[PDB]
Design an enzyme around this catalytic site. Structure first.
Site, PDB file in Angstrom:
ATOM      1  N   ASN A 172       0.813  -1.209   0.000  1.00  0.00           N
ATOM      2  CA  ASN A 172       0.000   0.000   0.000  1.00  0.00           C
ATOM      3  C   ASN A 172       0.850   1.264   0.000  1.00  0.00           C
ATOM      4  OD1 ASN A 172      -2.415  -1.438  -0.011  1.00  0.00           O
ATOM      5  ND2 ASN A 172      -2.579  -1.439   2.221  1.00  0.00           N
TER       6      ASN A 172
ATOM      7  N   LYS B 184      12.707 -18.777 -30.321  1.00  0.00           N
ATOM      8  CA  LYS B 184      11.971 -17.703 -30.970  1.00  0.00           C
ATOM      9  C   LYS B 184      11.392 -18.190 -32.292  1.00  0.00           C
ATOM     10  CE  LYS B 184      13.286 -14.393 -28.043  1.00  0.00           C
ATOM     11  NZ  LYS B 184      12.340 -13.895 -27.010  1.00  0.00           N
TER      12      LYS B 184
ATOM     13  N   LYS C 273       8.578 -15.597 -30.126  1.00  0.00           N
ATOM     14  CA  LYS C 273       8.016 -15.636 -28.776  1.00  0.00           C
ATOM     15  C   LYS C 273       6.715 -16.429 -28.716  1.00  0.00           C
ATOM     16  CE  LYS C 273       8.901 -12.279 -26.069  1.00  0.00           C
ATOM     17  NZ  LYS C 273       9.077 -10.920 -25.480  1.00  0.00           N
TER      18      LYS C 273
ATOM     19  N   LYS D 175      15.315 -22.731 -22.962  1.00  0.00           N
ATOM     20  CA  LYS D 175      14.171 -22.326 -22.161  1.00  0.00           C
ATOM     21  C   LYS D 175      13.009 -21.909 -23.061  1.00  0.00           C
ATOM     22  CE  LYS D 175      13.965 -18.319 -20.221  1.00  0.00           C
ATOM     23  NZ  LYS D 175      12.930 -17.782 -21.085  1.00  0.00           N
ATOM     24  N   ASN D 176      11.785 -22.155 -22.594  1.00  0.00           N
ATOM     25  CA  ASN D 176      10.599 -21.554 -23.196  1.00  0.00           C
ATOM     26  C   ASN D 176      10.736 -20.046 -23.132  1.00  0.00           C
ATOM     27  OD1 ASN D 176       8.568 -24.197 -22.071  1.00  0.00           O
ATOM     28  ND2 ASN D 176       8.517 -23.455 -24.187  1.00  0.00           N
ATOM     29  N   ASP D 177      10.216 -19.346 -24.130  1.00  0.00           N
ATOM     30  CA  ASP D 177       9.940 -17.936 -23.916  1.00  0.00           C
ATOM     31  C   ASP D 177       8.843 -17.819 -22.866  1.00  0.00           C
ATOM     32  OD1 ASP D 177      10.447 -15.264 -24.306  1.00  0.00           O
ATOM     33  OD2 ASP D 177      10.175 -15.345 -26.483  1.00  0.00           O
ATOM     34  N   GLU D 178       8.843 -16.701 -22.139  1.00  0.00           N
ATOM     35  CA  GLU D 178       8.001 -16.610 -20.950  1.00  0.00           C
ATOM     36  C   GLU D 178       6.507 -16.823 -21.201  1.00  0.00           C
ATOM     37  OE1 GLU D 178      10.065 -14.062 -21.867  1.00  0.00           O
ATOM     38  OE2 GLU D 178       8.618 -12.788 -22.926  1.00  0.00           O
TER      39      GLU D 178
ATOM     40  N   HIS E 134      11.522 -16.517 -13.901  1.00  0.00           N
ATOM     41  CA  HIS E 134      11.483 -15.484 -14.925  1.00  0.00           C
ATOM     42  C   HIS E 134      10.707 -14.297 -14.371  1.00  0.00           C
ATOM     43  CE1 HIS E 134      10.570 -13.286 -18.589  1.00  0.00           C
ATOM     44  NE2 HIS E 134      11.386 -14.069 -19.274  1.00  0.00           N
ATOM     45  N   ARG E 135      11.275 -13.104 -14.524  1.00  0.00           N
ATOM     46  CA  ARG E 135      10.780 -11.890 -13.884  1.00  0.00           C
ATOM     47  C   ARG E 135      10.052 -10.987 -14.864  1.00  0.00           C
ATOM     48  NH1 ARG E 135      16.088  -7.996 -13.101  1.00  0.00           N
ATOM     49  NH2 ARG E 135      16.843  -8.241 -15.251  1.00  0.00           N
TER      50      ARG E 135
ATOM     51  N   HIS F   8      16.792 -14.042 -13.513  1.00  0.00           N
ATOM     52  CA  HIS F   8      17.440 -13.100 -14.408  1.00  0.00           C
ATOM     53  C   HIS F   8      17.933 -11.900 -13.615  1.00  0.00           C
ATOM     54  CE1 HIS F   8      15.714 -14.861 -18.311  1.00  0.00           C
ATOM     55  NE2 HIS F   8      15.414 -15.693 -17.329  1.00  0.00           N
TER      56      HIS F   8
ATOM     57  N   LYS G  26      19.942  -5.579 -24.109  1.00  0.00           N
ATOM     58  CA  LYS G  26      18.839  -4.684 -24.436  1.00  0.00           C
ATOM     59  C   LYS G  26      17.971  -4.288 -23.250  1.00  0.00           C
ATOM     60  CE  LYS G  26      15.383  -8.242 -25.419  1.00  0.00           C
ATOM     61  NZ  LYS G  26      14.686  -9.070 -26.436  1.00  0.00           N
TER      62      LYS G  26
ATOM     63  N   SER H  53      20.229 -12.578 -19.891  1.00  0.00           N
ATOM     64  CA  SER H  53      19.383 -12.612 -21.074  1.00  0.00           C
ATOM     65  C   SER H  53      19.016 -11.205 -21.510  1.00  0.00           C
ATOM     66  CB  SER H  53      18.104 -13.411 -20.810  1.00  0.00           C
ATOM     67  OG  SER H  53      17.467 -13.749 -22.026  1.00  0.00           O
TER      68      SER H  53
HETATM   69  O1  LIG Z   1      11.771 -12.200 -24.291  1.00  0.00           O
HETATM   70  C1  LIG Z   1      12.996 -11.902 -24.220  1.00  0.00           C
HETATM   71  O2  LIG Z   1      13.393 -10.749 -24.547  1.00  0.00           O
HETATM   72  C2  LIG Z   1      14.009 -12.949 -23.756  1.00  0.00           C
HETATM   73  O3  LIG Z   1      13.528 -14.218 -24.099  1.00  0.00           O
HETATM   74  C3  LIG Z   1      15.343 -12.698 -24.466  1.00  0.00           C
HETATM   75  O4  LIG Z   1      15.159 -12.816 -25.850  1.00  0.00           O
HETATM   76  P1  LIG Z   1      16.356 -12.366 -26.894  1.00  0.00           P
HETATM   77  O5  LIG Z   1      17.530 -13.300 -26.739  1.00  0.00           O
HETATM   78  O6  LIG Z   1      15.784 -12.476 -28.286  1.00  0.00           O
HETATM   79  O7  LIG Z   1      16.851 -10.957 -26.649  1.00  0.00           O
HETATM   80  C4  LIG Z   1      14.204 -12.910 -22.238  1.00  0.00           C
HETATM   81  O8  LIG Z   1      13.091 -13.495 -21.625  1.00  0.00           O
HETATM   82  C5  LIG Z   1      14.412 -11.488 -21.712  1.00  0.00           C
HETATM   83  O9  LIG Z   1      15.765 -11.155 -21.838  1.00  0.00           O
HETATM   84  C6  LIG Z   1      14.035 -11.380 -20.235  1.00  0.00           C
HETATM   85  O10 LIG Z   1      14.547 -10.174 -19.738  1.00  0.00           O
HETATM   86  P2  LIG Z   1      15.366 -10.217 -18.321  1.00  0.00           P
HETATM   87  O11 LIG Z   1      16.541 -11.129 -18.498  1.00  0.00           O
HETATM   88  O12 LIG Z   1      15.868  -8.845 -17.964  1.00  0.00           O
HETATM   89  O13 LIG Z   1      14.460 -10.753 -17.250  1.00  0.00           O
HETATM   90  O1  LIG Z   2      -3.989  -0.442   4.634  1.00  0.00           O
HETATM   91  C1  LIG Z   2      -4.834   0.449   4.323  1.00  0.00           C
HETATM   92  O2  LIG Z   2      -4.456   1.644   4.154  1.00  0.00           O
HETATM   93  C2  LIG Z   2      -6.317   0.088   4.172  1.00  0.00           C
HETATM   94  O3  LIG Z   2      -6.643  -0.915   5.095  1.00  0.00           O
HETATM   95  C3  LIG Z   2      -7.170   1.307   4.499  1.00  0.00           C
HETATM   96  O4  LIG Z   2      -6.949   1.612   5.841  1.00  0.00           O
HETATM   97  P1  LIG Z   2      -7.569   2.999   6.480  1.00  0.00           P
HETATM   98  O5  LIG Z   2      -9.077   2.942   6.550  1.00  0.00           O
HETATM   99  O6  LIG Z   2      -6.926   3.147   7.844  1.00  0.00           O
HETATM  100  O7  LIG Z   2      -7.235   4.183   5.598  1.00  0.00           O
HETATM  101  C4  LIG Z   2      -6.643  -0.401   2.758  1.00  0.00           C
HETATM  102  O8  LIG Z   2      -5.984  -1.615   2.520  1.00  0.00           O
HETATM  103  C5  LIG Z   2      -6.240   0.619   1.690  1.00  0.00           C
HETATM  104  O9  LIG Z   2      -7.294   1.505   1.432  1.00  0.00           O
HETATM  105  C6  LIG Z   2      -5.935  -0.108   0.384  1.00  0.00           C
HETATM  106  O10 LIG Z   2      -5.660   0.836  -0.613  1.00  0.00           O
HETATM  107  P2  LIG Z   2      -6.541   0.773  -1.993  1.00  0.00           P
HETATM  108  O11 LIG Z   2      -7.982   0.987  -1.643  1.00  0.00           O
HETATM  109  O12 LIG Z   2      -6.090   1.850  -2.943  1.00  0.00           O
HETATM  110  O13 LIG Z   2      -6.409  -0.593  -2.607  1.00  0.00           O
HETATM  111 MG   LIG Z   3      11.677 -14.172 -23.124  1.00  0.00          MG
HETATM  112 MG   LIG Z   4      -5.209  -2.429   4.492  1.00  0.00          MG
END
Ligand SMILES: O=C(O)[C@@](O)(COP(=O)(O)O)[C@H](O)[C@H](O)COP(=O)(O)O
Ligand SMILES: O=C(O)[C@@](O)(COP(=O)(O)O)[C@H](O)[C@H](O)COP(=O)(O)O
Ligand SMILES: [Mg+2]
Ligand SMILES: [Mg+2]
Ligand SMILES: [Mg+2]
Ligand SMILES: [Mg+2]
Ligand SMILES: [Mg+2]
Lengths: 457, 457, 117, 117
Positions: free
Chosen positions: B101, B153, B155, B179-182, B273-274, B307, B315, B384
């Protein structure tokens, strides 16, 4: 530039085979808007940083299409053949395509998804909500008015007994709905099983004293899937049907947790708490996707309700435009984005019953009975963050509806006369709004509202 | 401002009861840095937008503490009693506390987590990795050198057979890892089960022709947990032990998917994978948390590899500083953050064997055998994004190690002579680096590397 | 076919009269429709046309002969949506309806799956 | 004539999304070869004896295409998006599309499938 992804003005993108999206894009020094758009379309569908040599005619037929550009506002329209998305209504896969690697591309300095369109043929493949706000209303036997709820505060540190006490005091003061704070779970000092048991006991006591049912949204976000299922099953074994909802930290726990609870417990309100979405949605982050997009995808995944913001009245970032647009994306049969008009129906727009229902909705009539095979069920906007009795009426005026859940934490539990008085104060403020009396005038003979005026000004 | 959360200079924050974090914070005009720090500490532990009236002495003893401030760099040191975090090593719960939050607070314009510290007593409570790069090396029977892999590739858009062909061509050309592409999953045109069977057959053929084992990391990101488990079980049923890894879209699928695969298939390489992390980690986004932080938590959850970036050579956004820091967070027993020194050991720092292992690591010796009860296992950096044979040597030089997996997509599949030639070209570029011969001179009698030089320049 | 031969064979078991009893219509022909286009509707669109035909007084809907489990028209969802459409027609008119499902499949196990579903 | 099924020379038929077929067609007196081809392509994919009023843009993107004609030899080349065929490798469904109702049309005097791709 990868020109194979540029087909400006292609009229086939509207044929129901494509999910459409608008990005606000800006590339590094040297790249034009259409160049940045081609590279983003490549990295969010079939390609990579250069033309793919192993591409086939088939895979090229599944390319994403940049079909419109607005240079002045740095806007780009891309079309995605939703056939490329994982089957079984996989939403995390959609987000991986369009909101995945493109956010880390060094050559893209601005990459913000502003709107997305789901064609009816695409909507067919996904769950949509199953238990709606109307079901919760039926259980609570409250009609028309907003659902008044609280977040038990402090965010962490209470024992299970103290937690159940605050539940009791809020419900007993006329409150309808209590939710866990998003990180409350199975801390040693607040055993989850005992928390559930004490909540049940407190609810039984309120029902005995008032004759009214109540609802508690339990946070089931866990370390792993087995633990979440364990918690959910325990709650089912301990709470009466309809008296409990399932809360999931959608962003930090992941879309898979949402979809799993939606499918495993379809008859329980799925409460999508969006803790962490700011990194995607905040205006200050040029990279990510906006709150309207998050809301539309949360409806696609099947959340019974999601937080949509207080339109700037409370403490979380947002304005009336975006937050009200989100609430309408959640509720309406016909909802308008910044760039796409969405009809939450898997049926052709030309259908007479559909156009009729849309007209009746513009007139205030409910579409929920239109036909299970014909609409994506409504999702409930949840209004939270810095709210107190003084602000509820302003919000109702701003959003233009009462079909929602409000939850107040410090707006209830920091009330000078206690939790029960805080709940009474919110109900009295709602009566003040409903009778068109100012809070100052109405509080003349309402002690709780008068103290809320004192503390919260 | 909520003063109950400000205890600058508190000496109890280093006693092992607290996880530490540094935020770069900027509140709205009128708010001082310590004010914004108090509000952030409140919304990320026990409090809310105002002092909580229902707080107890106990819960206030569990408050987060702002214990240090740097006005010049807008830096704030906050200590969180990790007792408030959900038990069972729940990482999603931590991320909900400190990265939830607080990212949506309207009064905070910058909120970026820059570093985090795990005391040994906290590390005890979490999984950490179980299957390491060393295990994969044992399976592949390759020592010392980086693990060379590819992303298939395009993707999306290939059939299961065409996909297996590209796997075969890459492995047969000397590549170790595919690896699979994501986003690749169970698209109708690329059936997942058939894709798995074809991968097994291709692997069998490569093993027949070369006598060498191979590894394929399958994307099991799915709509729900049951589908992911179904895929994982199928892959286990079709592939030989050690020959497959499980890829999970950690960000979009969620930390719960990560922890679930780690705990359910601990003897299988978990490939985090992120896809999507950018919205959190990019320098341009003032709200979120950085890549070193993401990596430390990925190691906490137990990912076998994540990664970590190409240090700006490829890139994806990143510099040598952050990306190499992330790779060391993943690999080393003693890793340095921007503000915290991390020892990945649940054992007192004073221990003679631990300090000895730290010294031996400074000399290039492995700590993996130090004792399962005293170390968090090493996690593998995956390199990557826009990489090709011309850049691998530069990366190795910048990172200063070879314990990593490189994965190349267009750097292989766009090679003018095909996939097999692309794999041979990466191997020749590594040989050029290893013998201190320039790529230019080495390519004189290496055709594949020569064409890679012409194409990728 | 001589009578001694007929003994060895099934002959029909469910007849038009059985359907008449269910539909509660006597004498007159059973009026039905084939959902068109032959292919290309989603399960929702298909159920919509089923509803529209039944609501207009039609008794009987049949799949077009190749309609089955196409990815864009999921078979399970098609069945559920037809059920709901029939439910709505029965509520609005008080009249029962009939839908003939195509269970022609690739192999025998898939057909039995469809029928049991 | 159902013109929506005539796209002579369409180069997208070679992109792998279509199974190709050749018919020997002869319609009744008065119908040209392209006429018989329009009706056959309609009845072997998405259409019927007249334009389908309930068709969607999606469904029309799955129309069969008569993409080639040989007047002298009464030959017609039609393309079928194999996405319309029942999944699970259903072959009887392909034969239902391309070798089903088209064999019973009164207006077709010759209808012989000669090769398929
Ligand atoms: O989709 C893509 O771009 C890739 O498959 C690389 O392909 P390429 O070899 O064709 O560039 C990787 O998943 C990314 O690099 C992930 O980024 P990161 O490593 O920062 O998580
Ligand atoms: O943690 C908090 O702040 C809350 O419990 C509200 O508390 P209060 O009543 O004390 O303000 C809710 O989770 C937020 O509103 C979520 O944000 P959103 O609605 O944007 O998802
Ligand atoms: Mg990929
Ligand atoms: Mg809350
Ligand atoms: Mg010792
Ligand atoms: Mg209708
Ligand atoms: Mg028919």
């Amino acid at each position: 530039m990868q020109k194979e992804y540029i087909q400006i003005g292609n009229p086939n993108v509207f044929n129901g085979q494509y999910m459409l999206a608008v990005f606000r894009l800006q590339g590094e020094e040297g790249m034009t808007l259409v160049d940045t758009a081609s590279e983003v379309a490549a990295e969010s569908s079939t390609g990579s940083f250069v033309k793919i040599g192993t591409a086939t005619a088939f895979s090229e037929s599944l390319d994403a299409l940049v079909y419109r550009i607005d240079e002045k506002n740095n806007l780009v329209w891309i079309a995605y053949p939703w056939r490329i998305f994982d089957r079984g209504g996989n939403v995390q896969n959609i987000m991986t395509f369009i909101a995945g690697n493109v956010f880390g591309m060094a050559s893209v300095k601005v990459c913000k998804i502003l709107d997305v369109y789901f064609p009816p043929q695409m909507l067919v493949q996904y769950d949509g909500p199953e238990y709606t706000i109307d079901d919760m209303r039926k259980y609570l036997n409250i009609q028309e008015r907003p659902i008044f709820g609280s977040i038990i505060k402090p965010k962490i540190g209470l024992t299970s007994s103290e937690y159940a006490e605050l539940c009791y005091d809020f419900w007993s003061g006329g409150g309808d709905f209590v939710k866990n704070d998003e990180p409350q779970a199975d801390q040693d000092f607040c055993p989850y099983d005992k928390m559930v048991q004490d909540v049940r006991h407190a609810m039984d006591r309120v029902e005995q004293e008032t004759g009214k049912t109540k609802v508690h949204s339990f946070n089931i976000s866990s370390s792993d899937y087995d633990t979440m299922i364990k918690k959910a099953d325990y709650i089912q074994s301990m709470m009466k049907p309809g008296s409990y909802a399932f809360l999931v930290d959608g962003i930090t726990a992941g879309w898979m947790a949402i979809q799993t609870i939606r499918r495993k417990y379809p008859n329980v309100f799925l409460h999508f708490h969006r803790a962490g979405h700011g990194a995607f949605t905040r205006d200050e982050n040029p990279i990510g996707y906006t709150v309207p997009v998050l809301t539309k995808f949360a409806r696609l995944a099947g959340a019974s309700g999601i937080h949509t913001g207080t339109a700037g009245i409370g403490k979380m970032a947002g304005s009336p435009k975006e937050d009200v647009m989100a609430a309408r994306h959640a509720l309406k049969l016909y909802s308008e984005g910044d760039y796409f008009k969405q009809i939450w129906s898997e049926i052709p727009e030309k259908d007479a019953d559909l156009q009729l229902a849309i007209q009746k909705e513009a007139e205030g009539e409910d579409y929920s009975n239109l036909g299970y095979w014909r609409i994506t069920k409504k999702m409930c906007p949840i209004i939270s963050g810095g709210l107190n009795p003084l602000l509820i009426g302003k919000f109702i005026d701003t959003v233009g509806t009462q079909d929602f859940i409000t939850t107040m934490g410090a707006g209830v539990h920091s009330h000078p006369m206690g939790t029960k008085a805080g709940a009474t104060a919110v109900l009295q403020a709602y009566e003040a709004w409903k009778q068109k009396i100012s809070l100052e005038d109405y509080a003349k003979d309402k002690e709780e509202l008068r103290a809320a005026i004192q503390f919260y000004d």
